[PDB]
Ligand binder design. Structure first.
Ligand SMILES: CCN1C(=O)c2cccc3c(S(=O)(=O)N4CCC[C@@H]4CO)ccc1c23
Length: 123
């Protein structure tokens, strides 16, 4: 396993924004409770899960546990940065797998709920 993504960085500029507040309180916390959320709640453990080729293929890993901690820690400057982390988590799943796989059916469901929730954000 490689080191997981950072959740703190003192030299990074950050802001507390009403859209970032919403991304934590509503968007992340709703997805988290979905029946298909559990494979995405922490970094991939290629050793436990016996996926030795995962980090040989995926070079920008991301997961909802990392996002949650970034949100709680005031890591982001704006909502587009957080939205980009979500998009990376979903794209990684489609790169490493194939259409029809159980994990892909799960990611497709969460991605549609995610887009429904960010369709309208607070001003
Ligand atoms: C989202 C990150 N991510 C992948 O890209 C991926 C590829 C193959 C299996 C898994 C598993 S799992 O073995 O625990 N399991 C969970 C249900 C489906 C799958 C078994 O079919 C958990 C998380 C994963 C994968």
């Amino acid at each position: 396993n490689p080191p997981p993504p950072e959740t703190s960085n003192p030299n990074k500029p950050k802001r507390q924004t009403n859209q970032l507040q919403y991304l934590l309180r509503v968007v992340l916390k709703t997805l988290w409770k979905h029946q298909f959320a559990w494979p995405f709640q922490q970094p991939v453990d290629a050793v436990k899960l016996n996926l030795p080729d995962y980090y040989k293929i995926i070079k920008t890993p991301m997961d909802m546990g990392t996002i949650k901690k970034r949100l709680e820690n005031n890591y982001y400057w704006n909502a587009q940065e957080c939205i980009q982390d979500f998009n990376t988590m979903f794209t990684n799943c489609y790169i490493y797998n194939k259409p029809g796989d159980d994990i892909v059916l799960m990611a497709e469901a969460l991605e549609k709920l995610f887009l429904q929730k960010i369709n309208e954000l607070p001003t």
